[PDB]
Design a protein around this ligand. Structure first.
Ligand SMILES: [Mg+2]
Ligand SMILES: [Zn+2]
Length: 207
């Protein structure tokens, strides 16, 4: 039980908001065979696709949560099943996608039968990739609250050290800002409706 026919048609029309000739970044959290967060981003217009997926392998998810995304698995229980395959299905033919480390992105697209999509492998160094990390999280903190856990990294002299969690959306933004040499001035806008990315949406708080 994935997307209904009405959801698929809404997704198809929403994909027209993407400029197939403009630069499109993409990044994922989790392994390509079991992703939990997916983001596509067109900095020219600010349009972005952002959604989540419940993991199949809970054991590997715990490790990815500790060393990468810090997502609580219980926050993914209300995600829309089949949305990953549906979004990749609706991507324009022969689309060019930019990403930092295209290997895992390629495996994901190929598993969905999308070998027509051309990938541009950006190879930013570790220090260059995070040069705008603090600024992007500060400006776009409201766009993703899914990274609640403490993410750690091993240091060569013993013990762990907390790092900023990795977000597939903040990655697209901060990597594009590093390559562009400055943060984009466009106002970001979600392509996917909110009732499509989550099956149950919490209503706005009445104060
Ligand atoms: Mg990546
Ligand atoms: Zn995120």
């Amino acid at each position: 039980a994935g997307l209904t026919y009405s959801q698929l048609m809404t997704l198809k029309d929403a994909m027209l908001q993407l400029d197939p000739n403009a630069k499109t970044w993409m990044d994922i959290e989790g392994r390509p065979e079991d992703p939990v967060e997916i983001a596509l981003y067109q900095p020219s217009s600010g349009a972005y696709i952002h959604f989540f997926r419940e993991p199949t392998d809970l054991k590997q998810f715990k490790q990815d949560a500790k060393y990468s995304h810090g997502i609580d698995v219980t926050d993914l229980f209300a995600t829309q099943p089949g949305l990953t395959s549906a979004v990749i299905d609706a991507l324009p033919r022969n689309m060019v996608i930019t990403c930092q480390g295209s290997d895992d992105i390629r495996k994901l697209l190929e598993s969905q039968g999308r070998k027509d999509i051309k990938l541009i492998d950006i190879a930013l160094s570790k220090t260059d990739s995070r040069k705008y990390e603090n600024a992007v999280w500060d400006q776009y903190k409201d766009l993703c609250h899914m990274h609640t856990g403490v993410v750690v990294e091993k240091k060569k002299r013993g013990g762990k050290e907390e790092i900023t969690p990795h977000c597939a959306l903040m990655d697209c933004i901060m990597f594009d800002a590093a390559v562009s040499g400055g943060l984009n001035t466009s106002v970001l806008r979600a392509v996917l409706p909110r009732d499509m990315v989550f099956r149950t949406s919490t209503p706005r708080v009445v104060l």
